[PDB]
Every structure is written in C-alpha cells, then in structure tokens.
C-alpha cells in the first residue's frame, strides 16, 4: 500500500532521479500519474529556488571538500528538532541535487547513486515513520495545494537558509 515502507521507499527513489540533475543544460536530452504531478511540482519549486539569488549565493559558499560529512551534517540539522514538515523534505531533495552539481568525481555516475543513497538512507532512518503518518507520498502532493508556489519557495528557502548558515 501507499503507506508500506516498500512503497514509500520506492516512490522516493523515483522522485530523486527525476529531480536531481547531473548537468546544467539539457541539449540532447538523456538518451504512475500521481507520481508525475509530484515530479513536476518538485521541478517547478526547484526552478523557483534556483531563481532566489540570496539562496544561491549562500549555497555556493558551502564547503564540499568532504561531501558525505556535509550532507549528513546538513540533513541532520534540518530534522533535529523533531518537528518534521514537507517543506523540509523538499529542502532535503534540493540540497541533495546541489551537492551533485558541486562535488567532483572521476565517475560522477557513481557519485549520483552515492548521494541518492545518502538521501534514501537518511529518509529511511529518520523520516520513514513520519511519511507514513502523512498517508505516504500523497502528503507532499496535498502539501503543494495548501499554498502557492511562492509560499512554498520562500519557506523551503528559509529552511535551507537556517541549515546552511550554521553548518
């Protein structure tokens, strides 16, 4: 079912792949329906976050010499207070994609599975119980209807702002 850990962990990996970019462009390309509305709404918010230059200046100033340490330190800081919300989950996905775009690797195709693994690892160990309390990944979909694209963007950017300003 939608609240089973198998399904929650399955839909989440499909979201990461469709959201996390490994390049800046798109030329040449790379060659469920409720899942599709999530994949697209994540994209719309990603480009809205990408166009907040206050956020980008602070993201660019983040050290990435140790990508693993940076990821787990930042993800843990986002969920340490125990008051989870969907905006923080979006901020987790976005920060994961920014790491992929700013951390070198002679086999970047491996660094992307590695960073995707870190996010799913953190999701399983820390968020899986809360996500099924929310009816599954449908909670994120219904969360995008409780506000406009700016209400979510400003909030998600503030989550990232608080977690990148200390760690």
């Amino acid at each position, epitope marked *: 079912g939608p609240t089973s850990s198998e399904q929650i962990m399955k839909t989440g990996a499909l979201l990461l792949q469709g959201f996390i970019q490994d390049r*800046a462009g798109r030329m040449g390309g790379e060659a469920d329906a409720s899942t599709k509305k999530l994949s697209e709404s994540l994209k719309r918010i990603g480009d809205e976050l990408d166009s907040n230059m206050e956020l980008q200046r602070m993201i660019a100033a983040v050290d990435t010499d140790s990508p693993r340490e940076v990821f787990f330190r930042v993800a843990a800081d986002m969920f340490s207070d125990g008051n989870f919300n969907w905006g923080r989950v979006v901020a987790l996905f976005y920060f994961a994609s920014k790491l992929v775009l700013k951390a070198l*690797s002679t086999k970047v195709p491996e660094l992307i599975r590695t960073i995707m693994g870190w996010t799913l690892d953190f999701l399983r160990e820390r968020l899986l119980g809360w996500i099924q309390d929310q009816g599954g990944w449908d909670g994120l979909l219904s969360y995008f209807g409780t506000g406009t694209w700016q209400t979510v963007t400003i909030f998600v950017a503030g989550v990232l702002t608080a977690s990148l300003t200390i760690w």
Partner: antibody
Amino acid sequence: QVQLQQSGAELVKPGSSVKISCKASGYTFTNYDMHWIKQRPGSGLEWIGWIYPGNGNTKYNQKFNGKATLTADKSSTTAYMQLSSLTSEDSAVYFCVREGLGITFEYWGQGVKVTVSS
Amino acid sequence: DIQMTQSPSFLSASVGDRVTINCKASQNVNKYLDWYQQNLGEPPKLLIYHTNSLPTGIPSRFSGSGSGTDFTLTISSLQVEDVATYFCLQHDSGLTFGSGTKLEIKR
C-alpha cells in the same frame, strides 16, 4: 560579455594526440555546460560531446567515444578536449561552445584548425 | 541517431526577397530545433532557437516555424549581411546538424 578563447592551430602527425584548450571568461564557469563541435568538408558539423564543469560529468557522441576526451579545470575556467589516435579523417576545425540557460549555443570559441598529415 | 534533411542546398535571392529554408527530421524532435548562421572563417551564430525564439540582438526579419518533424526558417526581407550559410540543429535526442544551405545574391 561572455568570451571563449581557444588555443592555437595544430599540425600533428598521424597516430598521435592533441589537447585543445577553451579559455572561458565573463561568467560563472561552473553554471553552464560546454560542448565541442567538429566542422569538416563532407562530414559537416558534428556534435562531439559536452562537459559540465560543476562536477566533471560528460556525455559523448557514440561516434567520438575513445576519440575525444573532455576535461575542464574549475580554477582556470578552461575546457580541454583530447583527441586520440589521429588520422587524416580528424583534420577539421574544432569549436567549444557554451550551452546557455533557457537558450542554446549562444557563444562560441573561434575554432582551432587541426591538420593531421605525415 | 536522428537524421536531418535540409533543403535547398543552394539558394539564390535578391535584396528585399522573402526567403524560406527548410529542414526535415527523420523523427519527431518536438520544439528543440535551432537555426544557425555561418560566414566565412567564423563560428556559427545562433539565429533562432527552440523552433521560433529570437536571441537578443537578432533582427526581427528572421523568424522560424515548425511542427516537430518539418521546420522552416524565414527571412522576410533579405538584406546583404544575410548572405551566408545556414544550418539547422536538433537537440531533442542527441544533437544532429543539417548539411547546410548556401545563400547567394542574384545579379
């Protein structure tokens, strides 16, 4: 202005290699993909591949896999292409070109004419 | 790979003519088709991207249209500096350039 300054013309013997550089300036180097293009009479314009300087990711045309190797150095804002196992069929003009954002090949390098002959 | 058939290969026109160049794709490439202009000894220059968008600085007399498989670049009134070679480029699946169209002036 965005500027893409490419290295000097090349005269190489067959079977050797050559490394062409593309010096970028006027923008944040790690926010744009950089492509390479081959122009030659008959073959025309062919896409070789691109590289994203932000993390070093690359994608290659199947016809140029093994032939070309795309690299970039963040701190120098320079892109490199290494052409291997040179033959007469590789005598051509090679361009680096930047892929824009919401826009395609807007800024080009001037081209580097590579001449392979014995 | 996707094949691009460009036509005509050679086009004779006069200053002030409405000129049309055609490009056909062996497979639907959606909107991801550009047109480039090249003069002698120079890199190509973006004239039209995404079937019909004009880069900043490109004169309005250039316009483009398409369907996914059939595409057309149009010069509404040819001027002298438009005498060049023109190429189409699909970037939907891989990247493929057309063979080119050489535009000359009549006399």
